[PDB]
Enzyme design. Structure first.
Site: not given
Ligand SMILES: c1ccc2c(c1)COC21CCNCC1
Ligand SMILES: NC(=O)C1=CN([C@@H]2O[C@H](COP(=O)(O)OP(=O)(O)OC[C@H]3O[C@@H](n4cnc5c(N)ncnc54)[C@H](OP(=O)(O)O)[C@@H]3O)[C@@H](O)[C@H]2O)C=CC1
Ligand SMILES: c1ccc2c(c1)COC21CCNCC1
Lengths: 512, 529
Positions: A6, A27, A126, A129, A147, A288, A336, A397, A419, A458
């Site tokens: 994540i 970072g 979590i 690098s 994200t 336009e 228009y 329109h 279209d 289409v």
């Molecule tokens: C350490 C680990 C993870 C995180 C942080 C520090 C700061 O915010 C996150 C959690 C939320 N998503 C982004 C990264």
């Protein structure tokens, strides 16, 4: 096992070719590049501290494998990550050199040796690098909950490239705004039920599903499990018409696929819906809109600004088949522009001073938004039935209608002729801008732009192009900057319009 | 309980029987006449009957084989003996099914395959504890259905409602509301010249990783359920209790619920108070039914005279008052015209409204007595010529919203425009409504423009397809709440049918007698106050 990553990734500071990799920056100086993101934090928190009751056997909590890279960066208030089993890949320090009630490891495999010994639901990775790096290199990561902060920041560290062949996306969330940037959340990856079947007893079979398109071509589209990104309101209509649409030849003897009656809703408070599966341009179309507000019916004003949206409909030849034999080239007639500011007036030519002749709807709708927000008569109608004949073509329109609840302004635009391949994309942009424009000059926050499609078609030779398009995963939408100082609808100029952070796939010729 | 283990179900089809009217589910009971069906065939009832009684899912067997023990796969059909002899022979025994007959006067030793022969209920259990079968459907007739229900042996019922009246001598037995609740109702269809629908009754109590992500992607959802408007959804027991709400009326009801649960609190002009949302589409297939709300009573004489009035081009309120249609009475009184600043306008001269615009758009309104001969655009005549000669056109519109005339009108139009659409000699119609009273207005407006689409479709020698209704300002009045709550817990009856007199070939030439709403089955009228 049940191992997951994540990350949260922004774009990096130094024609640009965008791709999945665009979003890497993780970072900047032992902290995030962005100083805070509330919605990203919350998502990450909800993800990493959720457990299903059952799904174990096949309290109960999740693991959160960070590193010294990361761990240390975290303040003391959050630590040790509330309601989670923390772990720390540090060669440098043992349990003797840390405070909180944590577990440590040293080798990647010493997580396996810890996990085979532990009670959990799911295992989350979590940050680091390198803590992502060697985990991918050692095929250990099932899904990646990723994200995309759709803004640009200074960074020193990255997230490693992702192998198209190794990992593919299977979910794209709704797009959000928060902390003055858009963002979205994607996922990478390596007796009352037979009742459903009975109620479907009368549908298409297997080779009756009208149209000769193929599944094989939509490999990546049909793959996605959750398609919650709002560009999919457009993409699924391409997919509905392609597959279920009636075959018609038109006026010209050409060839389309048509359906009747669709509604798209776009939340302008959270994004600007500029489709991202192909390059789009907005100078042409913002000019336009300004031409419309100024009340012009003068083809030349736009031509001289190299906006050629109406060139085709001004030619000697096109006016002559409308029977407009008494109409100067590029005098498009009461269209228009004229209907918005002068509706009811007799039209002469495009040079005439029309000041104070006819109904100035635009002023009217604006005064109604200000004076009577709860009105249900705030329409802007360009379809004057007296003047259709006199127009180079009838309005595509038909009407804008407006709604004001709690200092917030929504807008339905009803379109008679859509279209889907070329126009609709621009059309969604146009009336989105107008909605911001009317919102600003009326001291209101934009809410939803709402697009009703009538005859939605289409073209037959847009289809191969649209297949390419359906199989591209949407990027997070950009945002639209209006110059905040502008506060009358007539005081706007091209330079008051800025698109910020438009991430987009390659240009496509809908043609050939 | 015996039937959960052996998945024993009932399936039946019941018409309405030869004798204002009261209507309950006991309206539908007519099973057979003179040892055949009251209707000749159905066909879609047949196709539904076929799909269900022959549908098998071979994965979901083992769970049920396990369950039965502890106490090419096919279903079992169980059948009275005269129901067996009603079957036309070229179809005996019922293909791809285990046929069980129930008889005292016949045995094994006089059929010719045709079946298993049993002579007692608790004698079917013997066979099901022995046999390899998916589910067991009890297909009747009446004498079978009867003894099976009074034994509490049916787990659900696949009841088809044939919304026409036929001669009957055998009936389905009154279902008890306490023993059975409807969990599911289906789309309405037209087959062999009747509307029909499919309902399930249930016996009452008196990669699987594509699972978390939903929950995740659902993180930012507002409702844990500090209910957003003061509606207690435990007042909507029946509405929420239905599993599959596929009846096209649920598109109207569902919007009431979306507005009730999610509306914005607003108060208007007069102070009256509403809950509002912006932007809905409803579609109705006019080829399959006529969408006249069944969750309350609706009379159409008024809205039909009105539509004929519009087409005549009239704007004279008196014309309707002289036919006891009070729709526009409020909108034509000295008082009302006075607040509109129409002091030079005669009482009940409503001004350049629907009729005027359709027949004479862009003419200069004078009065309700001016015949406006060859003055302004005859839009209606234009849309009828566009559909005949130019069906591929995306410009076949009719617009009632004339910016120039808005202030001259008693009130601005609510029905801004119609756009027609023509595929394969079928005519779909879209109507945009700027303002929508969901409790009082939208019901009539649904029937009004559905009725108009039929009228055009006939004079352009086309079949009606979809009436598509776009709502903009969608509002339920705070006084309509209680009544709409009551309406939401009524289960729709199959839509009636609309028959126009087919000799009419001009849009001008329709008269009140040329319109027949057949088989309107409905709940009792609700005053929205
Ligand atoms: C350490 C680990 C993870 C995180 C942080 C520090 C700061 O915010 C996150 C959690 C939320 N998503 C982004 C990264
Ligand atoms: N609307 C619908 O969905 C359906 C309609 N129908 C209609 O219903 C009519 C037939 O129904 P109905 O007249 O009630 O006749 P049934 O189909 O119920 O058959 C009655 C006969 O079945 C045998 N039987 C019934 N119960 C038992 C039992 N417990 N043990 C032994 N034998 C038993 C007897 O045969 P025997 O005389 O040999 O002793 C009895 O006379 C027809 O008009 C038919 O078209 C039929 C089924 C479905
Ligand atoms: C014997 C059993 C059941 C039936 C018949 C004969 C004739 O068609 C039905 C099935 C479909 N609904 C009508 C009744």
């Amino acid at each position: 096992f049940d191992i997951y990553a994540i990350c949260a990734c922004c774009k990096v500071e130094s024609n640009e070719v965008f791709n999945n990799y665009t979003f890497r920056g993780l970072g900047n100086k032992g902290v995030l590049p962005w100083k805070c993101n509330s919605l990203d934090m919350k998502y990450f928190c909800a993800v990493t501290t959720y457990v299903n009751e059952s799904k174990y056997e096949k309290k109960l909590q999740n693991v959160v494998v960070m590193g010294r890279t990361s761990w240390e960066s975290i303040p003391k208030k959050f630590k040790p990550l509330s309601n989670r089993i923390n772990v720390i890949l540090s060669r440098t320090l043992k349990k003797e050199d840390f405070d909180e009630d944590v577990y440590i490891i040293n080798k990647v495999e010493d997580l396996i040796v810890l996990l085979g010994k532990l009670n959990y639901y799911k295992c989350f990775i979590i940050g680091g690098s390198v803590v992502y790096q060697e985990f991918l290199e050692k095929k250990l990561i099932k899904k990646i909950y990723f994200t995309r902060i759709n803004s640009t920041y200074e960074c020193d560290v990255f997230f490693p490239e992702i192998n198209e062949n190794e990992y593919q996306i299977i979910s794209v969330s709704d797009v959000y705004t928060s902390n003055n940037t858009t963002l979205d959340f994607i996922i990478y990856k390596k007796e009352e039920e037979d009742d459903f079947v009975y109620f479907n007893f009368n549908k298409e079979k297997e080779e009756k599903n009208k149209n000769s398109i193929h599944p094989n071509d939509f490999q990546i589209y049909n793959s996605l499990k959750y398609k919650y990104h709002p560009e999919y309101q457009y993409l699924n209509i391409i997919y509905d018409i392609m597959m279920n649409g009636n075959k018609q030849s038109d006026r010209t003897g050409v060839g389309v696929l048509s359906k009747f009656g669709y509604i798209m809703k776009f939340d302008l408070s959270q994004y600007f819906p500029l489709l991202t599966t192909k390059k789009l341009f907005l100078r042409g179309i913002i000019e336009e809109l300004l031409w419309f507000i100024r009340g012009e019916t003068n083809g030349n004003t736009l031509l001289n600004k190299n906006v050629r949206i109406w060139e085709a409909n001004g030619t000697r030849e096109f006016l002559d088949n409308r029977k407009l034999f008494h109409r100067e080239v590029n005098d498009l007639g009461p269209i228009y522009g004229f209907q918005w500011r002068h509706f009811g007036a007799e039209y002469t030519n495009m040079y005439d001073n029309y000041e104070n002749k006819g109904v100035d709807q635009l002023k009217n709708i604006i005064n109604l938004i200000k004076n009577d927000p709860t009105s249900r008569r705030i329409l802007l109608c360009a379809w004057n039935v007296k003047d259709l004949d006199q127009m180079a073509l009838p309005p595509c329109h038909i009407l804008c209608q407006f709604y004001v609840f709690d200092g917030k302004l929504s807008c339905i635009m009803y379109q008679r002729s859509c279209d889907l391949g070329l126009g609709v994309p621009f059309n969604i942009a146009s009336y989105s801008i107008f909605t911001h424009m009317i919102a600003q000059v009326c001291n209101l926050q934009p809410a939803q732009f709402i697009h009703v499609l009538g005859n939605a078609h289409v073209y037959n030779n847009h289809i191969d192009s649209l297949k390419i398009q359906l199989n591209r995963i949407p990027y997070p939408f950009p945002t639209l900057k209006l110059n905040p100082d502008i506060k009358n609808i007539e005081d706007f100029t091209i330079s008051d319009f800025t698109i910020q952070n438009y991430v987009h796939h390659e240009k496509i010729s809908m043609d050939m």
